[PDB]
Amino acid sequence: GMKRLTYISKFSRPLSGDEIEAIGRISSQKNQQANVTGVLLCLDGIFFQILEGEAEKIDRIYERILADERHTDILCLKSEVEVQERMFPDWSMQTINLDENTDFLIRPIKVLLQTLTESHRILEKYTQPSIFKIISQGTNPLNIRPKAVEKIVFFSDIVSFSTFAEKLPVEEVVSVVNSYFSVCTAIITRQGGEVTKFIGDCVMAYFDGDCADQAIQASLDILMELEILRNSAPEGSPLRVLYSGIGLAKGKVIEGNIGSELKRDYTILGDAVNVAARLEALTRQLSQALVFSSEVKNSATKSWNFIWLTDSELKGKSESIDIYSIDNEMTREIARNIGHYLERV
Amino acid sequence: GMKRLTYISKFSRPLSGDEIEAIGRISSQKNQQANVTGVLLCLDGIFFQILEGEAEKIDRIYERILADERHTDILCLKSEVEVQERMFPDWSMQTINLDENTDFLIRPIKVLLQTLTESHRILEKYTQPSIFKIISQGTNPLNIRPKAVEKIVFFSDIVSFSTFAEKLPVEEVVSVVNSYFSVCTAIITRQGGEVTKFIGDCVMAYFDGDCADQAIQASLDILMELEILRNSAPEGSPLRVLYSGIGLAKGKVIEGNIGSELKRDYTILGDAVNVAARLEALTRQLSQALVFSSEVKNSATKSWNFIWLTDSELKGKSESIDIYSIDNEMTREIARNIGHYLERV
Ligand SMILES: [Ca+2]
Ligand SMILES: [Ca+2]
Ligand SMILES: [Ca+2]
Ligand SMILES: [Ca+2]
């Protein structure tokens, strides 16, 4: 019935040795009253901690730790559920300050610890957020059994992206794409979605199958933020001609340990390439910045201002599907305008 | 003019404490004659090592270490070029066996080191191979300046994938896709290419812009291995109806620090979704398992048995491009056959 968690974090401000000693002594007192044990280490502005005890007590202590202003960038490396024995039975909280330790054998160990944590922080940026979520639940992501799950799938793209690449220096093109990706990822994550990959200039994301309201709201919020960005940019900025198309569909996703010894993935949506290309064509053909299928429309619970637009084909199959949008002032040739503006700047 | 490298590795077989002591003593003797210094640590079947010295000497020692049968899964975590001072000036090679150390303060440090290295090995599987290549060259991948580079782009997909997902249990579908991904990634990597992402059932990979011969050979080798797999599988195996289409094109790729604070990528190919969907349509429309554009044909140096097939449009633009294949016994409705075979199994 025991839990044990291990995490790393970063100092949010310079902390002196006496403040670290005080955190350890207060933690030892509170942990003793809760029957919790463990160890706390610091090195060059990094915290490492291991906590063990009854599951409910550990969960409540950890939530408090997450709100402590004195550190940030919390990353849980390991969560062990149904723990057999305690590893630190005599330590309510033992504090080890490695900055102050001068022992002969510990010196190369400090170098090694610092190098491993820095490499870890780089790897963190290039990996999905699902893997870390699975890790915090006590599961090794390589050991998950496969499952099929219904999702709302989100695809967004940049209008006339090739014009940017043809007319601007490469450093400017990267500035534009990064501004776009930052807007999309912030809003999708705020509404409970998960960005799964970038495919060229296209953002691919998932929402739960009964969260169509959140997927529609995220789409409208992205359109609103891009209009604000276009209007508020400096004179002559390429951001003034950044436009997006968005399409939503429903699909069967497989979660599991996918890939080869060389490269792994956590999820696969078969024929994702074809669904994305068909939605891109629809936003262009209809001159509508947001389109979605009847399946998405029917999963929504709120009274959105829906409008029927046309029939299309989204899957490889030959069924004819009704396509909808939202009728509002927001959604009410761009490529020709983009080329001329970018030309004379 | 000094270099310093840090790497981790795994024991390839049980090694006793005396064999580890012997590796350290021989390393100390050879390093002293080469003016190289550093430290070697072991814990629970993991090696950690730091080496420092003149760049040419370090490079030659490291190549020998990579060939030593006694460890495997070498991963360079950090490479520092133009090093100022030595960190271990009095240690030709100091050996620290942590399995045998019982010191009070070192016990929680061993637990922490083991947990960090295990988390690292998981993250390794979900990250591209480019990042690690850039790391070994002494560069932090988040600090690269953006560059545009010509590449040969490879896209391969599974014929009638939706039929597999509709007719088999999910664990069987994953078995099929993993067999496919393993074949493709092994052959692409052997021919000098790099797999960059999986997009649904589609493999996306890059070859250097003057390596069309290697991209064509990889494609032919994948087709050959899949025919062998189909013929040699057990009676009733779904692998008997695994077929692939492959398309090659040339494109301008941007390398850099791409993305948001939430998620980063190393490379972007604009409109990758559209190029992949157009090549998929061509393999189906022509009933040809391998297609490529005139640009790929013209970058090849060997005297391949080229055959002209048709004109098509690959980019968003309106230029009409000649499409070619290779005329051989290999390349000389499948979906209907797949459904019937999968139905009665
Ligand atoms: Ca496909
Ligand atoms: Ca209809
Ligand atoms: Ca696009
Ligand atoms: Ca022609």
TrEMBL record, chains A, B:
Binding site for Mg(2+): D157, I158, D201
Stored PROSITE patterns: BLUF (PS50925), GUANYLATE_CYCLASE_2 (PS50125)
Residues that bind FMN 2: K30, N31, Q49, R64, D68, R70
SMART domains: BLUF, CYCc
Domain of life assignment: Bacteria
Residues that bind ATP: S160, F161, S162, G270, N274, R284
Protein residues bound to Ca(2+) 2: D311, D322
Binding of FMN 3, residues: N31, Q49, D68, R70
Family statement drawn from the similarity comment of this UniProt entry: Belongs to the adenylyl cyclase class-3 family.
The protein's name in its UniProt record: Family 3 adenylate cyclase
